[PDB]
C-alpha cells in the first residue's frame, strides 16, 4: 500500500526524467532547422541563377548565324 | 478517505505518464528520421536545372527559323 | 495536512498531465497530417519544368526574328 | 517514508510544470511556421515568373538582330 505508493511515485519519476530529456532533444532539434521560408528562397535563387547563365549563355545562336553568315 | 484517494490518482498519473512517454519517443523518432530540407531541396533542384537544360540544349525553336532559311538541324 | 498536501499537489499533477496529453496529441496530429516532403517535392518539381517547357516550346521570341528576316509567321 | 513520498510528488509536479512550458514551446514552433505544401507553391511560382520574364525579355534575339540587321 505505501510501498506500493512509493514503487509507483518512483517509476513517475524516473520516467519523467526521460520523458524531459526527449522533450529537450525535440526543442532542440527544432531549433536546429532553418526556417522552410529560408531554405526554400535560397535553393529557388540557385535554380533560376544556374539557369539564368544558361539562358544567357544563348546556346541556340550558333546554328542560325551559320545559316546566315555572320 | 486520503491515501486510498491519493493511491489511486498516483496509479492514474503513472499510466497516463506511459502514454505521453510512448507519444515522445513517436514525435522525435519522426522528426529525427526525416532527412533535411536543404539536402532534399538540393537534389530536386538538381533534377529541374538538369531537366531544363536538356531541353533548352536542345534549340526547340531553331528549327522554325532553320526552316524560314532554307535549311535543317 | 500532510495527506492534503499530497492530496491537492498529486490533482495538480493530474489536471497538468490531461493538458499535456491534449498539446502532445495536438503535436502528433499536426506532423502526422504533413504530406512527406520528398513526395510535395516531386509534385512541385514537375510542375515548374512543366510550365517552363510550355513556355521555351511556345517560342515567344521567334515572331521578332522572322519580322525582322522579313518573313511573316504562319 | 511518508516523508519520501511528500518529497517525490513535489519534484513530480515541477518538473511537470517545465515539461508544460517546452510542448507549449513546441507547440508554438511548430504552429509558427506555413504548411510545407503553401510555401513550395508561392516558391515555385516566383520561380517560374522570374525565368518568365527572362525568356520573355528574349536575351539572345539582340545578338541575332545586329546579324540581320547587317550586309556582307
Same mark, same amino acid.
Given at each position: =500500500? *505505501? =510501498? #506500493?505508493? #512509493? !514503487? @509507483? +511515485?518512483? %517509476?513517475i519519476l524516473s520516467d519523467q526524467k526521460?520523458?524531459? &530529456?526527449?522533450? !529537450? &532533444?525535440?526543442? %532542440? *532539434?527544432?531549433g536546429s #532547422?532553418?526556417? /522552410?521560408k529560408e531554405s526554400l528562397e535560397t535553393v529557388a535563387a !540557385?535554380? +533560376?541563377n544556374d539557369l539564368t547563365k544558361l /539562358?544567357?549563355?544563348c546556346p541556340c =545562336? !550558333? @546554328?542560325? *548565324? %551559320? &545559316?546566315?553568315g555572320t
Open positions: =500500500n *505505501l =510501498n #506500493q505508493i #512509493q !514503487k @509507483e +511515485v518512483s %517509476e526521460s520523458m524531459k &530529456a526527449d522533450i !529537450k &532533444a525535440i526543442l %532542440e *532539434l527544432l #532547422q532553418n526556417p /522552410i !540557385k535554380i +533560376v /539562358i544567357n549563355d =545562336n !550558333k @546554328e542560325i *548565324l %551559320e &545559316a546566315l
